[PDB]
Write a protein that binds this ligand. Sequence first.
Ligand SMILES: O=C(O)c1ccccc1O
Ligand SMILES: O=C(O)c1ccccc1O
Ligand SMILES: O=C(O)c1ccccc1O
Ligand SMILES: O=C(O)c1ccccc1O
Ligand SMILES: O=C(O)c1ccccc1O
Ligand SMILES: O=C(O)c1ccccc1O
Lengths: 132, 132
Amino acid sequence: LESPLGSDLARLVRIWRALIDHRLKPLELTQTHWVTLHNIHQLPPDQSQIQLAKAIGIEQPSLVRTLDQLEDKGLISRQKRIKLTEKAEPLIAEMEEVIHKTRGEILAGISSEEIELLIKLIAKLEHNIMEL
Amino acid sequence: LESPLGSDLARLVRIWRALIDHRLKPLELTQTHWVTLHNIHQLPPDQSQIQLAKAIGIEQPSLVRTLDQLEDKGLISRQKRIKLTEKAEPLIAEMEEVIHKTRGEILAGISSEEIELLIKLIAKLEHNIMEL
Ligand SMILES: O=C(O)c1ccccc1O
Ligand SMILES: O=C(O)c1ccccc1O
Ligand SMILES: O=C(O)c1ccccc1O
Ligand SMILES: O=C(O)c1ccccc1O
Ligand SMILES: O=C(O)c1ccccc1O
Ligand SMILES: O=C(O)c1ccccc1O
């Protein structure tokens, strides 16, 4: 088709992130940090590095500086598997609450069956991509 | 809702970009560079800095290093308005061809009326976001 789908989506995702970044600044989480912690939070327990980078859609080595920092601030433990600490729990719970609440306002006036099709479509687009 | 829409989209967009990045590496365009040139290309002629950052969904100062480089390699001219040069034309045309062609393969088996709803939905999501 003619329509610039990938850059429409890429803009949307940038402005949605930027809204969240603003709302989370008091927590002085940077983008990369909350993105990565959120991702850890929505995965099941004990992810390998490799599962995490994949769920994010990035390549490990970029993941590693971000993880190293989080480990430095004691947010995260590794023994290569990944566990949120006791110490990150209040920070996470408040982060997730702002993210959840922002999603409810973003999703306002969009029907569940419309959101359900978006999700199934995202899936197919990604499958095409991975198949290449 | 419960569903992690923003990170689904953010993954999709990361893996779609990464596919394009791979395909464009022979041209040794970096991500930021092709993203920005593509954006310039799909806009009407002579954008201000400000229109460009907005179409991308970023804030000007990040835009500026990238533009400075492009101007250094003679891809781009400014007099604060922005014009692709004569010299960038073959590079652009080949870039756009790879992007266009990648979109056709990504969009395979998805109906036009389904792609048309995605586009209208992206629009509404962004409007909610800007309204905040
Ligand atoms: O601008 C982007 O980030 C982008 C991402 C995927 C496809 C096309 C694009 O312009
Ligand atoms: O792009 C990155 O470097 C990155 C690193 C960690 C988490 C999310 C990210 O996009
Ligand atoms: O909607 C707001 O005003 C807001 C501000 C910060 C965090 C979550 C929010 O909903
Ligand atoms: O992971 C992201 O980049 C992201 C972007 C917007 C909303 C939620 C997210 O996790
Ligand atoms: O995030 C950036 O710094 C950036 C800069 C120029 C173009 C696209 C971008 O995402
Ligand atoms: O599909 C491919 O093999 C390909 C490779 C590079 C550029 C555009 C493409 O379609």
